[model samples]
Target: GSSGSSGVCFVKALYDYEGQTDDELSFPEGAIIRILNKENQDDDGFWEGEFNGRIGVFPSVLVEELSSGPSSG
Candidate 1:
């Protein structure tokens, strides 16, 4: 059963890691991530994705909701 329903949204993730060196930024690991897609009829454009417990804004054109969802998508 496939439904057109989706729960995607967005959040902003600014700054890599405060007070951290540049070298480590290249291979940053163990960073937490969350993606957000616009709601059913939201006119606001841009897709926001959260990372490292931080917020990062992105264009809506670059986002896609997980089919099965975070658990299995």
Candidate 2:
């Protein structure tokens, strides 16, 4: 039953982050995170995601997708 699924997509941080609001996410350089939502998927440059059980928005430019999708491949 491997199904090859982890439920979330991981992204690699390209820059260090310092959250500006309670809804924003923070992480150090090279941190990996799972995207919970694509808040503004159509070119808005930000996304809703989680790190260590904390959910928040993060800049899309700060991370690179580590998987092919948020849906089953």
Candidate 3:
């Protein structure tokens, strides 16, 4: 559950990703990723986010969003 929920938006990875370029992120399935863009992005599936202390871009379609959530368990 979203206990003690804060206003930080996040994307929960729905699929495993292996990035082709260094700028992209290679995250495992069900990763907790925090997006960098505070403002809304265009609807073209653009997702620039951070995981494992690194920031990188990935496909938007492969993730599900939770607008407010707790930091960790």
| lDDT to native, each model | 0.40, 0.81, 0.78
lDDT of model 1 at position 35? 61
Clashing pairs counted in every model: 11, 0, 0
List the candidate 3 regions with Cα displacement exceeding 4 Å: 1-7, 38-44, 67-73
Number of residue pairs clashing in candidate 3, backbone atoms closer than 3 angstroms, sequence gap of 3 or more or interchain: 0
Model 2 C-alpha lDDT per residue in residues 1-73, reported as the tens digit of each score: 8565457767988899899998889899999997776546466578888898889888778887785658675
Ranking by lDDT: 2, 3, 1
- Report the Cα lDDT for candidate 2: 0.81
C-alpha TM-scores of all predictions: 0.32, 0.69, 0.68
Better structure of 2 and 3 per TM-score: 2
Q: Candidate 1 overall Cα lDDT vs. reference?
A: 0.40
Candidate achieving the largest lDDT: 2
Worst 10 residues of 1 by lDDT: 22-31
* lDDT tens readout by residue for model 1, 1-73: 7867566533222323332442212112223336653443564553345554545444433333334446644
Top-TM-score candidate index: 2
Off by over 4 Å in 2: 1-7, 39-43, 67-73
Candidate 2 clash pair list? none
